Every structure is written in structure tokens, then in C-alpha cells.
Amino acid sequence: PLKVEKFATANRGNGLRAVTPLRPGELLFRSDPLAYTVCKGSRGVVCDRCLLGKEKLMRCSQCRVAKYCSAKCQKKAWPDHKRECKCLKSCKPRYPPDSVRLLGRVVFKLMDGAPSESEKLYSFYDLESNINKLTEDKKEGLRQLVMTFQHFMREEIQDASQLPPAFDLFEAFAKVICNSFTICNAEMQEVGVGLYPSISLLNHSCDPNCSIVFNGPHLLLRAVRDIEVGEELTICYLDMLMTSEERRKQLRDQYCFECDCFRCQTQDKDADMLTGDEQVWKEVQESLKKIEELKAHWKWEQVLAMCQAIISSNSERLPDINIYQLKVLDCAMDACINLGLLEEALFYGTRTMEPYRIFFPGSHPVRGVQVMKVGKLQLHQGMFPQAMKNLRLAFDIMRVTHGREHSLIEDLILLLEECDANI
Ligand SMILES: O=C1Cc2cc(C(=O)N[C@H]3C[C@H]4CC[C@@H](C3)N4S(=O)(=O)N3CCC(NCc4ccccc4)CC3)c(Cl)cc2N1
Ligand SMILES: C[S@@+](CC[C@H](N)C(=O)[O-])C[C@H]1O[C@@H](n2cnc3c(N)ncnc32)[C@H](O)[C@@H]1O
Ligand SMILES: [Zn+2]
Ligand SMILES: [Zn+2]
Ligand SMILES: [Zn+2]
Numbered sequence: 001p002l003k004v005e006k007f008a009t010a011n012r013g014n015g016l017r018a019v020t021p022l023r024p025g026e027l028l029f030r031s032d033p034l035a036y037t038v039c040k041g042s043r044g045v046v047c048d049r050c051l052l053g054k055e056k057l058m059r060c061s062q063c064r065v066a067k068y069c070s071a072k073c074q075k076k077a078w079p080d081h082k083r084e085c086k087c088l089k090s091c092k093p094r095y096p097p098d099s100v101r102l103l104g105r106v107v108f109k110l111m112d113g114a115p116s117e118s119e120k121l122y123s124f125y126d127l128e129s130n131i132n133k134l135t136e137d138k139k140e141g142l143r144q145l146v147m148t149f150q151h152f153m154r155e156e157i158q159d160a161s162q163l164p165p166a167f168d169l170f171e172a173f174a175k176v177i178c179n180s181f182t183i184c185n186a187e188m189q190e191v192g193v194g195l196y197p198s199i200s201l202l203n204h205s206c207d208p209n210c211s212i213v214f215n216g217p218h219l220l221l222r223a224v225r226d227i228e229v230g231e232e233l234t235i236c237y238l239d240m241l242m243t244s245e246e247r248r249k250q251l252r253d254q255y256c257f258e259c260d261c262f263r264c265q266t267q268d269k270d271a272d273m274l275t276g277d278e279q280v281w282k283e284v285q286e287s288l289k290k291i292e293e294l295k296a297h298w299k300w301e302q303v304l305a306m307c308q309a310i311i312s313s314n315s316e317r318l319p320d321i322n323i324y325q326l327k328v329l330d331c332a333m334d335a336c337i338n339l340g341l342l343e344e345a346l347f348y349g350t351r352t353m354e355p356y357r358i359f360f361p362g363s364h365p366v367r368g369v370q371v372m373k374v375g376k377l378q379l380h381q382g383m384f385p386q387a388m389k390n391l392r393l394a395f396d397i398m399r400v401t402h403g404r405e406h407s408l409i410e411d412l413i414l415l416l417e418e419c420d421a422n423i
Pocket of ligand 2: 256
């Protein structure tokens with residue numbers, strides 16, 4: 001019994017809107033991907049199927065590229081892995097761009113698979129391609145991806161008959177660039193990339209009324225505000241820790257539109273995001289490219305060493321409300337968590353709390369997770385008043401953003417029961 005419907009918007013293509021009134025935290029839609037895969041940096045670190053980290057993964061012996069937490073996941077992934085296996089084998093030791101592997105899985109799913117539930121409201125066929133808006137160098141990039149695909153698929157796909165009817169590879173890559181979801185794990189690390197075509201109906205806002213959250217590859221779409229019958233549903237395509245200029249560029253480059261929202265009109269919060277010595281935060285911005293690369297490959301010790309040279313720099317420092325400092329602090333926290341340095345993690349974690357309160361207003365899944373992490377760190381150092389405060393806060397946010405259908409909630413519920421014992 002669906003609470004949402006596709007409709008044609010006035011000036012931003014198709015969209016999704018409420019059929020009934022919606023309360024904050026209400027579950028609107030849930031979906032497995034049409035197709036999905038591990039990100040290049042998380043390959044060999046998380047299970048290809050369920051996208052969880054394990055220190056020891058089993059590999060597919062044919063290709064030795066697909067790896068798995070367990071026999072269960074490896075056997076169940078086989079149907080959707082079969083045909084890419086060969087392609088991946090012959091490609092070695094060089095690995096295709098994530099978008100190519102993803103499209104491969106799309107083409108196999110469409111050709112070999114039953115009709116997907118992910119396409120109930122909107123199919124891959126319907127996805128926006130923005131073809132008449134692409135720049136020539138973006139076009140050039142798509143043509144390279146098309147030829148990369150043909151090379152990668154030379155064995156499994158020789159001609160048009162093995163693609164769907166009237167399938168155009170250029171058009172399909174155009175779809176993939178602006179309809180690919182970055183799948184994040186429970187701790188909000190980017191772990192994979194997928195297509196969820198029904199979810200791709202939702203248009204963008206820098207102040208959205210809905211939210212999406214991932215439980216492995218399974219995506220949950222929830223309302224994070226009150227929403228009236230006939231009102232457009234929106235999610236934020238972007239990281240909240242971006243300036244309007246940074247949002248402008250990515251929404252142009254990747255999604256081919258100009259955002260007309262209040263926040264973009266007023267440069268909302270931009271000034272506060274860029275406080276401190278300009279010179280210092282440009283070096284830190286520079287350095288974050290390297291830091292974020294190390295983090296995507298889970299190289300925690302190096303992430304932390306780089307972060308500590310900024311946070312505890314002998315030279316001039318930034319305020320924690322500065323978004324580049326903030327990012328550096330979050331990376332540091334997470335590095336310390338995974339290296340088992342729980343004291344240092346907590347120092348950093350606590351310092352992110354006020355800026356997150358400001359930058360993730362209402363109910364945002366990323367703040368809820370950050371608060372849980374800080375609450376969790378406190379709990380396991382004996383700070384039971386403070387910990388209980390944050391865990392209840394995390395629950396207040398995540399009951400809206402995650403909901404009882406997400407298993408991280410059950411983990412928090414147990415943490416709440418536990419911390420409740422002391423009092
Ligand atoms: O048709 C489509 C295709 C598509 C893609 C996306 C999408 O993938 N968005 C990204 C993933 C998530 C959700 C929004 C934003 C960008 N992120 S995030 O920022 O919430 N996310 C990824 C980055 C993480 N880390 C932030 C960080 C970076 C660097 C240092 C410290 C922290 C936190 C979780 C979204 Cl939201 C909608 C959508 N509709
Ligand atoms: C994932 S889709 C959203 C659904 C899309 N509108 C459609 O018709 O299929 C992304 C595309 O929708 C359009 N879009 C999304 N949010 C928008 C906004 N706030 N303003 C204008 N266009 C937007 C852009 O063309 C963008 O590339
Ligand atoms: Zn698994
Ligand atoms: Zn294989
Ligand atoms: Zn905007």
C-alpha cells in the first residue's frame with residue numbers, strides 16, 4: 001500500500017510526492033539494488049555481497065577478485081557474479097572503474113534476471129541521462145567508459161543481441177553517472193556503489209524532507225519532516241559539509257542542474273564553514289585529498305598520522321566549526337576507533353559534536369551515527385551519565401533516520417538497555 005507516487009514536476013523532470021500525510025521517521029520505501037558492487041578501495045576489505053568488514057575474507061577461486069565474509073555470501077552472490085567472473089579474471093592485474101563493473105551487473109540483471117523490485121516505480125529504462133546537457137569533455141569521458149566496457153565485456157558480450165533491446169551504452173553510462181548511489185556502511189564509511197531506480201525519482205534539496213540510509217546494500221527511505229499530501233519528497237544528494245560553491249560545482253558536474261533552493265540563494269552557513277586563517281584551511285583542504293584517499297583504502301595508521309599533524313600542528317590551527325578541520329577531526333576519530341585508541345578517539349569525537357549539531361539540523365543519519373559513536377566511546381570508559389545522554393540523543397535522531405527496520409537500531413537499543421542498568 002504505497003504512500004508515494006511518481007508525478008511530472010514543473011521544471012526538474014519526474015519526481016516523487018506524498019499520497020498521504022507523512023510523519024517524521026515514517027518508512028516510505030525499501031529496496032535492494034538493481035545492481036551493486038564494492039568500491040575500488042574497499043575491495044578485499046569488505047564482503048562483496050553483504051558489504052561488511054572482516055579481517056579474513058574468502059576469495060572466489062576462479063577470478064580471485066570477488067571476496068567474501070563466508071560461504072553463505074559467496075554461494076548466494078554466485079548468480080549475479082557468474083558472468084562478471086570471467087571478465088574480472090582476464091582483466092587482472094588491472095581493475096575496471098567501479099561504474100563499468102556496476103553497468104556490467106546491470107546488463108546481466110536486465111538480460112538474465114527476473115524483473116527487479118527496485119524498479120517498481122521507475123526502471124533503469126526511465127532514468128534521467130541529461131544527454132542534452134553534457135559538456136564535450138564529459139562526453140569524451142563517457143566514450144572512454146563505453147570503450148572500457150566493451151573491452152571488459154569482450155568475452156561475455158560480443159554484440160547487440162546480448163544487450164537489452166535498443167540498449168545504448170553511451171546513454172547507459174550517462175544514466176549511471178547521475179543515478180549511482182554511494183552505499184555506506186553502519187559507521188558511515190563509503191563501501192560500495194549501486195543503482196536503486198525507484199529511489200532515483202527523488203529530486204535534490206540542500207534542506208530535504210526525506211532521508212536514505214543503507215543497511216548493507218539494502219536502502220531505507222524515510223521522512224525526516226512533516227509532509228503534506230501532494231508535497232514533493234526530496235533528499236540531499238550531497239555531503240552536508242560543503243559550501244554552496246562546492247555544492248554548485250558538483251550539482252553541475254554530476255547532475256546537470258542549478259540549485260534554486262533557499263540555502264544556495266543565501267550562501268547559508270558558508271561564512272561559518274570557512275572561519276579561521278584562509279591560508280591554513282586551503283593547505284588542510286589540499287591535505288584532505290590524500291587523507292580521504294587513505295581512508296577509502298582503510299589505511300588507518302597513515303590517516304591518523306596525517307590528521308595529528310593538523311590537529312596538533314605546531315603551526316597555526318583552525319576552529320572545529322571549519323568544515324575542513326571538522327572532516328580532519330572525523331577521520332581522526334574513526335582512525336583511532338579502528339586502531340583501538342579509544343581515549344584519543346573520544347577527544348576528537350567530542351569536539352565534532354557542536355559543529356555537527358549546527359551542520360546536520362533536524363534528523364540526519366550522519367549526525368545520529370556520530371553521536372552513537374561518541375556515546376559508545378564514553379560508555380566503554382565509565383562515563384555513564386554523559387554516555388546515556390548521547391545514546392538517548394542518537395536514538396532520538398536514528399529512530400527517525402534509521403527506524404526499527406535497520407539493525408543498527410537494535411544494537412543501540414541493547415546499548416541503551418545496558419547503560420540503563422547503571423542508573
Ligand atoms: O539518483 C540518485 C543518485 C544518488 C546518489 C546519492 C549519494 O550517493 N550521495 C552520497 C552518499 C551519502 C548520502 C549523501 C552524501 C553523498 N553521503 S554522506 O555524505 O551522507 N556519506 C558519505 C560520506 C561520509 N563521510 C563524510 C566525511 C568525509 C570526509 C571526512 C569526514 C567525513 C558520510 C556518509 C544520493 Cl543521496 C541520492 C542519489 N539519487
Ligand atoms: C536522480 S535524478 C532525479 C529524478 C529526475 N528528475 C528524473 O526525471 O528522473 C537526478 C536529476 O533530476 C534533476 N534534478 C534533481 N534535483 C533537482 C533540483 N533541485 N532542481 C532541478 N533539477 C533537479 C536533474 O536533472 C538531475 O540530474
Ligand atoms: Zn558477506
Ligand atoms: Zn569470480
Ligand atoms: Zn540548494
